[PDB]
Design a protein around this ligand. Structure first.
Ligand SMILES: CN(C)CCOc1ccc2cncc(NC(=O)Cc3cccc(Cl)c3)c2c1
Ligand SMILES: CN(C)CCOc1ccc2cncc(NC(=O)Cc3cccc(Cl)c3)c2c1
Ligand SMILES: [Cl-]
Lengths: 299, 300
């Protein structure tokens, strides 16, 4: 029993964190094989290729623990700077660079000065921002998932937006959202609730003995979406319905049956009650996260 | 900016998790130097659990009865002893991944990270607090026994908890790394219930200071209170009594924000009386008590 916001064990990622200094700027790098990846704004209207041509290898000070790494080359790929180093990381794990979709969750290893300080779980919002916990010096901190023994790197922190939310890129330097790496007026779009995740979390509550919100009713997918659109909820697709299949079979509650409960929770509230210790409807657990936490899959 | 429930990086602890098998039972062990620590109930059957005589069950065991597995490698047990509710298995190999560590006993209200394991393999990490009733609201399934709770302050891992059992209400009970249970619990299948739980008042106050640091002041009021008047109101909402130690410990946050501890106590009294009125504090619709004053100073 129990339901916590759970992160993947961070060990394979900790062995990759390095500190990158260029001039006055100091941020974090991800050392995989003989390449260190970090936000390109470490060299900072910035014409980045023009700023980079002026730089030489010995301008970038890379520090892995108490050891200095020697930069032997550098290139830029989108908004990430790739520093070729003289030493391959012996702690390099089995890895992939993956681009995630909004609604998908991942673990964040927050670092300052190449040293990991905390791990937390979070979701890529529909507006492409992440509601993270980051201070100055956290840039270059990475987001990941683990599949067996393969670490899938999906996010690298770049900046904080005026509302306190965070923006960054995949490990190929492509931003998530309509954001740019520079000092200019940028705002996060209006956010929406990840409907499929709230439903998965309602199924997790049923599995943990919380059934007060269930009813005898059902709904059509169109009628549910007409209601969901009124409450700033993401539209529920037939793919979402298919993906919720295993949880529906395990609990004996049809997806459109659980949708009718969510409909009543939106129109009438919780009435002083809680679900899984929460007074709000939680959307940062995917259907897979619910299944993994209620089966015990190890890494 | 931002405020998340954050766990310590689990890497130093992952390198210590092993699988311990004794007969039909399989649980997790903590391999530090040449010793593997695990719950002593690994020697028990489900029948034995009612009234087990551990000394009697252990005298009948030999080193080769305990199968210890570290990854794909089998460890050879060369000795065994019992210390309170923990079984200490002397192994022939010292763990090369052994970090700098301490065994610490925590007090209720203190937080720690839990690395949940099944079959000696870590599956997840989460942050949680030792409740005033000595239970932990964890996320544990069958096979999680032997999973540990820790804090990693600076370069040292301070082991403070080892999982032993789940209580009928879904909450968890365990020991410090010396085998001493937290709470009036026993490693026995007897009628045991968690006491009535209370809110960790000092932690809610620290979390209110964290919200002020992050720009949220809607909950503040022009009132102050005496410590006694605050505790008389707090008791009625099942809140732990706030002591003068708690007031002293909240000093740095009080100085940083410019809000006196008894002034913040006045906001909490009002919040307990009025609720949130559709508003949230740090993205929460409830008053959060699993962030200590030290956690707030570390994260903000
Ligand atoms: C001096 N004091 C006010 C600094 C604290 O500021 C902060 C505070 C919190 C931060 C959290 N994450 C990431 C930061 N970094 C940035 O957003 C830097 C930046 C600026 C313009 C464009 C880009 Cl791409 C990146 C954070 C900086
Ligand atoms: C359905 N049931 C028979 C399966 C087991 O379910 C569970 C489910 C969740 C569990 C979480 N933590 C720890 C468990 N283990 C124990 O409580 C084992 C035990 C029993 C009596 C006394 C002691 Cl000291 C220890 C959990 C077992
Ligand atoms: Cl303590």
């Amino acid at each position: 029993s129990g339901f916590r916001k759970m992160a993947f064990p961070s060990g394979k990622v900790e062995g990759c964190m390095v500190q990158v200094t260029c001039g006055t700027t100091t941020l974090n790098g991800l050392w995989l094989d003989d390449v260190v990846y970090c936000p390109r704004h470490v060299i900072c209207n910035p014409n980045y290729e023009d700023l980079l041509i002026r730089k030489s290898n010995h301008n970038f000070l890379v520090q892995a623990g108490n050891v200095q790494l020697r930069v032997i080359g550098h290139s830029m790929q989108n908004c990430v700077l790739k520093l070729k180093v003289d030493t391959a990381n012996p702690k390099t794990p089995k890895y992939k660079f993956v681009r995630i979709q909004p609604g998908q969750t991942f673990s964040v290893l927050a670092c300052y000065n190449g040293s990991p300080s905390g791990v937390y779980q979070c979701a890529m919002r529909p507006n492409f921002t992440i509601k993270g916990s980051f201070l100055n010096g956290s840039c270059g901190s990475v987001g990941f998932n683990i599949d067996y023994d393969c670490v899938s790197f999906c996010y690298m922190h770049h900046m904080e937006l005026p509302t306190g939310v965070h923006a960054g890129t995949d490990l190929e330097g492509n931003f998530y959202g309509p954001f740019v790496d520079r000092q200019t007026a940028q705002a996060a779009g209006t956010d929406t609730t990840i409907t499929v995740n709230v439903l998965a979390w309602l199924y997790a509550a049923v599995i943990n003995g919380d059934r007060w919100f269930l009813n005898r009713f059902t709904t059509t997918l169109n009628d549910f979406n007409l209601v969901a659109m009124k409450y700033n909820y993401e539209p529920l697709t037939q793919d979402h319905v298919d993906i919720l299949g295993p949880l529906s079979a395990q609990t004996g509650i049809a997806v459109l049956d659980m949708c009718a409960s969510l409909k009543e929770l939106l129109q009438n509230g919780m009435n002083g009650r809680t679900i899984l210790g929460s007074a709000l409807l939680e959307d940062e657990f995917t259907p897979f996260d619910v299944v993994r936490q209620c089966s015990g899959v190890t890494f």
